[PDB]
Design a protein around this ligand. Sequence first.
Ligand SMILES: *Cc1cc2c(cc1C)nc1c(=O)[nH]c(=O)nc-1n2C[C@H](O)[C@H](O)[C@H](O)COP(=O)(O)OP(=O)(O)OC[C@H]1O[C@@H](n2cnc3c(N)ncnc32)[C@H](O)[C@@H]1O
Ligand SMILES: Cc1ccn(-c2ncnc3[nH]cnc23)c1
Length: 457
Amino acid sequence: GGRLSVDASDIAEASRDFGGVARAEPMAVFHPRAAGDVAGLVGAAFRSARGFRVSARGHGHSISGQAQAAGGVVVDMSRVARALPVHSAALGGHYVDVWGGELWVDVLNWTLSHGGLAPRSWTDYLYLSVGGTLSNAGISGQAFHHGPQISNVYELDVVTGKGEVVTCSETENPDLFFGVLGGLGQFGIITRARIALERAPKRVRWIRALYSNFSEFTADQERLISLGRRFDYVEGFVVAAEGLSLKHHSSVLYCLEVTKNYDDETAGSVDQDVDTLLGELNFLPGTVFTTDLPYVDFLDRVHKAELKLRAKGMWEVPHPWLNLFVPASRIADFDRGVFRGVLAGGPVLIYPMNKHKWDPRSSAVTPDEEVFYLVAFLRSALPGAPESLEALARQNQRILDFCAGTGIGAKQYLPGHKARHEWAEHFGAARWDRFARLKAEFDPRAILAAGQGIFRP
Ligand SMILES: *Cc1cc2c(cc1C)nc1c(=O)[nH]c(=O)nc-1n2C[C@H](O)[C@H](O)[C@H](O)COP(=O)(O)OP(=O)(O)OC[C@H]1O[C@@H](n2cnc3c(N)ncnc32)[C@H](O)[C@@H]1O
Ligand SMILES: Cc1ccn(-c2ncnc3[nH]cnc23)c1
């Protein structure tokens, strides 16, 4: 049912990503119509003498060529007929079956227009594929409570490295199910994902509050994630005090970002619920900024920033992004060590998560502590300036050197490792053994997601 394409435009797109650095070209781009087509192509690669590389591409949001298939075939998973959301009395809630290449923004519009339902756990940006985020974790402000997107999926259909289609879940082929989740595309291509859904709120009360003290900012973020009244989203950002009294206390400001979701039924209590939660906090008085907007508009906020950047030609620039999971016991050292020390290129995100919401059976790698932070350096290099990218890449290495030199047991999220001993150290002995065993079972020829640079033929 599917077709091989050698169109130079398809080739060029399959040879690039959001990172803007890695440029490994495939021989062809495959456009499947169904799971059977993906299975046929992977089947061909597995049975070939050479054993060519096959990689699924979602929306091409990788930073270092993770979706690239050097001299092989890139499967363009992007998209008729869609499954409707379903209620189950056994699970006590709703779900929806989606194609692995579906963008979260399309999943959202679909579930909202069919029963006013929506996923519970997000990414900050919705123009990402389901297969792509489920191969990593999928994190945003809801993860502290609902867990990442890999903790909100009931079932998958996976095309293995042997071209076999397998239905898997916690009760059916669990080794494959848990291996694939956070598995970096190593054990198969997700063709179907059964996403957990909740009744969607209609509106969002979006709040931002400032702090000049890192100890007070982290203590409040940690208290908020332990919360029965609670915010529905908890994030934060590090900002230079200059780019805005508060300056006399600190040269670095920390912005706390929270939301309170509501609908027709809770609209009467939202204002007081917010006031009660805010009163318990230690943010700077008079620094509260509030916005009231529809749920879709809040979830799509990064796409709005994207459209503005595209107009100025500031979107298709190199993005040397660095994402770290930092144990909460070592977060204080980041303030003078990195935020005031090493530091750039754009926003610096920071927020804690609860490890108990992450299933330890998955392939995802988190620090060995109950509370850990995402610390994301979301830099953009200057357009057409290779030296700007080089200076930012040196800044990222200095951050990694700092973690190593002070014994911070940080773990990279969307890991950019390429050497065997780096991957061994990332996973650790027990997780590395489990990962290698899963590779021998599901992708012995190392056909899939070779751009990750973990295994070789
Ligand atoms: C660009 C970007 C990324 C991003 C983000 C905002 C922007 C502007 N915000 C994020 C956030 O808030 N939370 C989060 O967890 N991640 C965030 N990201 C990063 C993003 O999740 C990743 O880039 C991820 O890779 C998803 O992006 P995409 O869907 O574009 O996928 P890819 O980059 O093409 O491929 C990633 C890897 O997975 C393999 N792959 C792709 N599709 C599949 C399927 N269906 N099955 C199995 N493996 C698959 C690729 O081969 C590659 O190895
Ligand atoms: C290139 C760009 C512009 C805004 N962002 C983001 N802003 C806030 N949170 C984000 N999360 C992921 N990308 C984000 C990324």
